[PDB]
Design a binder for this molecule. Structure first.
Ligand SMILES: C[As](C)(=O)[O-]
Ligand SMILES: C[As](C)(=O)[O-]
Ligand SMILES: [Zn+2]
Ligand SMILES: [Zn+2]
Ligand SMILES: [Zn+2]
Ligand SMILES: [Zn+2]
Lengths: 330, 329
């Protein structure tokens, strides 16, 4: 229709504006923020940092972010709603499952997972009445049996509600190809789907092929370059040796192939992280001081210097997310 | 000290009475009860089932249960408080980690885990002000490197606060021997430690040796048995095919060996479970309609028929848990 669900309620599509389609307020685990807030210093501290971060993104032109933190990424929608009001930035919340599902999720059938996702979309998250506006899923190269169940549950929940699906992929392993095959076996329209972390490869033919089938290509790891850390056993597996300009030029390459309409760009940033090593957040902030403002402050100007016109950069950052997020059954 | 943290606040040891030492209101995962309460019908239905079940247990003489649900078993201490108050049964809450820690736990140092356990003990669980009176940990046969971190954190937390440590084990793999060695390397007295699920084995030499070192022995799976349900694979992989009377006779055994002061007895029951197959709660309730009342309604009289004196049984169900739960530094 004409309305997108956010943590503050429904908004009309024209209100979304410049939208970052793959972000996080906090990368954690289910129940963790509540049970151990001092891991982040304090809940208040984490919130205040996130509010400053969003206001900084807002002053760079960002109007909406999509928080693709799932249940098992320890999504706290109450936190999302708080920081959204204070920063005057729309936040779309996610259902789905990422890569750390607990036992109570891992043992569920595709039918039960479908019910969980649908409840979070149609009824609300926890007892908050806040509804998800996107379904997030994740696979590791060769899709596992449980992951296949997740993707099919996501497909079915999308098909009943018209909300889009967005994925975590290992692009180096061409992971989107198995994701796409599963989605298509369920009769899901590719234009409901973003294949994420896609800038983690130099294989353009892989990307272009997905695009040509109608998938959105999520180029969301541009500031995850991490230059110089090939000794750090934490910042050499996580992140690599590909410059942000190298990644960003994939955006240009896809535009030149005629697939500007299939491109989504983001940062995959956050303001706290507990799912990795202690103080990884300091590592990330040191390497990307712009945080969520990296896309509008660096990547957009870079693309302009490379001769990408304003109307195209507007289509990618405003029109493309809008079309993606608006619930549609085609 | 002679006071124990419960979910309704501190009680004196005298108040605990008949204490079921290894139980669960709900077996789940972190965040799960609050994200998907309809899995249990509703949160309300779950609380009311648990109030009914505890009330029957209270009728049968139980005054206190120990809920050894950790963070990663989806312990919702607000649920525990509600059902405790409504059934007027004491509940002691747990910190620690079970076998399903998430990345945010799995990636933590022993120093960090120590601080988390201390927080739930000294400050409170989440923002509730409810403090754990016990530390629950779990290993699987061979202790994993992360599981070793958890047990050392548990020991350090215990030595700082005096609260006891209860464990989950595979008695088939004599899991308690590995746990004990880790605990003792940290300087922890065995009198601060219960080795649980010890009734899954019939190896008395394993039990008595542990007992002789001063460890508490948790014979807590007594009502678990999938006899007549052998063609249901999920039932006999979770409950086994050993009679409850056989499990119970292990209690007599340790008494006869002179070890009554080391026995703790329980049902390891619960009123909802999401951390196993769907509708498994109905299979459990089918096997044991008595729920947490199985121990005082069936087991305790069974032991008296086999000639065990009343005072010894009272020492096991009252005195031993009191001594165990009392913060002893
Ligand atoms: C929260 As992530 C680093 O798996 O996109
Ligand atoms: C939570 As259990 C059934 O492993 O004691
Ligand atoms: Zn991801
Ligand atoms: Zn992400
Ligand atoms: Zn157990
Ligand atoms: Zn248990």
């Amino acid at each position: 229709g004409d309305r997108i669900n956010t943590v503050r309620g429904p908004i009309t599509i024209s209100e979304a504006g410049f939208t970052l389609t793959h972000e996080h307020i906090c990368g954690s685990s289910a129940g963790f923020l509540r049970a151990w807030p001092e891991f982040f210093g304090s809940r208040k501290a984490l919130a205040e940092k996130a509010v400053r971060g969003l206001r900084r993104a807002r002053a760079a032109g960002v109007r909406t972010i999509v928080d693709v933190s799932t249940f098992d990424l320890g999504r706290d929608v109450s936190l999302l709603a708080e920081v959204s009001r204070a920063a005057d930035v729309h936040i779309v919340a996610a259902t789905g499952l990422w890569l750390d599902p607990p036992l109570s999720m891992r043992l569920r059938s595709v039918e039960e997972l479908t019910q969980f996702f649908l409840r979070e979309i149609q009824y609300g998250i926890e007892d908050t009445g806040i509804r998800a506006g996107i379904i997030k899923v994740a696979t590791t190269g060769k899709v596992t049996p449980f992951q296949e169940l997740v993707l099919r549950a996501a497909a079915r929940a999308s098909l009943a509600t018209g909300v889009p699906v967005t994925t975590h992929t290992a692009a180096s392993q061409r992971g989107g190809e198995q994701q796409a095959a599963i989605f298509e076996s369920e009769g899901l329209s590719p234009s409901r789907v973003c294949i994420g972390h896609s800038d983690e490869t130099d294989d353009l033919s892989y990307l272009t092929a997905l695009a040509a089938r109608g998938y959105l290509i999520g180029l969301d790891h541009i500031p995850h370059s991490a230059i110089g850390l090939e000794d750090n056993a934490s910042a050499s597996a996580f992140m690599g040796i590909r410059s942000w300009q190298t990644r960003a030029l994939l955006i240009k390459a896809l535009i030149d192939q005629g697939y500007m309409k299939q491109i989504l760009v983001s940062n995959d940033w956050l303001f706290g992280i507990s799912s990795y090593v202690t103080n990884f957040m300091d590592v990330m902030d040191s390497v990307n001081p712009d945080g969520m403002a990296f896309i509008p402050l660096r990547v957009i100007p870079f693309l302009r210097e490379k001769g990408i016109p304003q109307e195209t950069l507007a289509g990618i950052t405003v029109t493309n997310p809008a079309r993606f997020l608006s619930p549609t059954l085609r």
